[PDB]
């Protein structure tokens, strides 16, 4: 539906980098998560990265692990996630919506049915976070068959062979992890290979990292856990939670004008 392409063109009009918050769907409840998402959007978030609750405790830090646990504790299911996604899309028809999920979710009712459901509720992209590039073809093909952008992660030491693959396979945005190779080198090579615009997603905790990412030439930044941390720290006070989210997103967008 051109949502990412149009966003990045309009960000170019604005001379801005994209700011893309991550949150877990249903954290800390269905209605609160819907309103957190409306608040992020109203405060200036350029696109959304939305997680279907998963479990990766050996690797995740406490912020992302606890958010998954809060969502499951609220009784969140994938079905409710897809209904939330449909509602967010109906209320906000133009914002790019990227799903982040883990492979276990799809190996329940099948790869094609998963991407069909994404297409049906209006998701724009899907990152299957724990699938090696070497095994990605069934996911990539299913995504393209259902008009979904498959998101590939560019790791920090990518050689040119891999950069060529990531550039060719992905659509919408490239999920870049770079603080191993210099940040500006990965960015330049991805542009050389006509990759989807790069969003720096490593360590995007506060305005300084957003500013560094845009100054290095990235098209924007994804905040993988900083929004979730504000949710966790303000659980007892929804009003203050939403106020702190609003000042956070405002500060991250200020940094994206650097
Ligand atoms: Cl994440």
Curated annotation (Swiss-Prot):
GO cellular component: cytosol
Alphabetized GO MF terms: tryptophan synthase activity
The enzyme's E.C. designation: 4.2.1.20
Listed GO biological process terms: L-tryptophan biosynthetic process
Disulfide bond annotation, renumbered to this chain: none
Domain of life: Bacteria
EC category: lyase
InterPro entries according to UniProt: Aldolase_TIM, RibuloseP-bd_barrel, Trp_synthase_alpha_AS, Trp_synthase_suA
Keywords, comma-separated and alphabetical: Allosteric enzyme, Amino-acid biosynthesis, Aromatic amino acid biosynthesis, Lyase, Tryptophan biosynthesis
Pathway it works in: Amino-acid biosynthesis; L-tryptophan biosynthesis; L-tryptophan from chorismate: step 5/5
Catalytic activities: (1S,2R)-1-C-(indol-3-yl)glycerol 3-phosphate + L-serine = D-glyceraldehyde 3-phosphate + L-tryptophan + H2O
HAMAP family attached to this UniProt entry: Trp_synth_alpha
Subunit annotation: Tetramer of two alpha and two beta chains.
Known function: The alpha subunit is responsible for the aldol cleavage of indoleglycerol phosphate to indole and glyceraldehyde 3-phosphate.
PANTHER family: TRYPTOPHAN SYNTHASE ALPHA CHAIN, CHLOROPLASTIC, TRYPTOPHAN SYNTHASE, ALPHA CHAIN
Family statement: Belongs to the TrpA family.
NCBIfam families reported for this sequence: trpA
Name under which the protein is recorded: Tryptophan synthase alpha chain
Gene: trpA
